[PDB]
Symmetry: C2
Subunit: 139 residues, 2 copies
């Protein structure tokens, strides 16, 4: 898209970074669904930040993997972004499955769903996503 909004981009990135920092508060506390939801939301907000940075607008209705696909076309600097973002799904992480039992295979609840190993792999993916996007927004 044509004209970017750097003020709004910075605002959303600030929150994305806060969400990733806060994921540390739930580590090794039997709250792995909260590590994963925080990382999912960090990822979503960082992508929306980048969308503001380029186009001055976004959509919170669009799934992160689809937002990442559009954003990745903005520059070769973002190569690999969509693969990173899609890895969250591969670990069974999305907005609804980290929160609601009716979306999980009976009888699982979110508190039962994610191992500490998975929460760690999800943090690694998220850190890489934020780094690719911060690099791109720095220019």
């Amino acid at each position: 898209g044509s004209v970017g909004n750097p003020v709004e981009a910075r605002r959303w990135l600030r929150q994305a970074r806060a969400n990733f920092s806060a994921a540390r508060n739930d580590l090794h506390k039997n709250a792995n669904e909260w590590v994963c939801f925080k990382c999912y939301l960090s990822t979503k907000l960082a992508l929306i930040a980048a969308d503001y940075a380029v186009r001055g607008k976004s959509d919170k209705d669009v799934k992160p993997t689809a937002l990442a696909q559009k954003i990745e076309e903005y520059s070769q600097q973002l190569e690999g972004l969509t693969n990173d973002v899609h890895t969250l799904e591969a670990y069974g992480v999305d907005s609804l499955k980290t929160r609601y039992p009716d979306l999980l295979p009976f009888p699982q609840i979110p508190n039962d769903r994610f191992t500490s190993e998975v929460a760690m792999r999800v943090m690694e993916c998220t850190a890489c996503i934020i780094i690719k996007l911060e690099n791109f927004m720095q220019q």
Copy 2:
């Protein structure tokens, strides 16, 4: 409602209790929006649990205060529930305002929206809700 599902009720309540416990992880860590969202989700899932316990079905597409209005009618034991649940909205807490900057007056982000005092009042309000619903479900 006429036929309850105690197994589903227990599933949902187990997750609500886990969310309320997880809220403690974010206290005094500059993550008050996460304290509030966790308490919001705890409240919502406990209401859904009570709805399962009474009629064996619910809706997660209804706002918590609206669900509480229906549930309050189930028993004298639940007197005051609707107002108890409405406290969250009164303190500026709901699903979107604890997560998304575009819902907040510029330049505010969730990470600077909630004071530590508001975070504490929200935990106390959530305690009151959980108490009322848990006592009722121990029918």
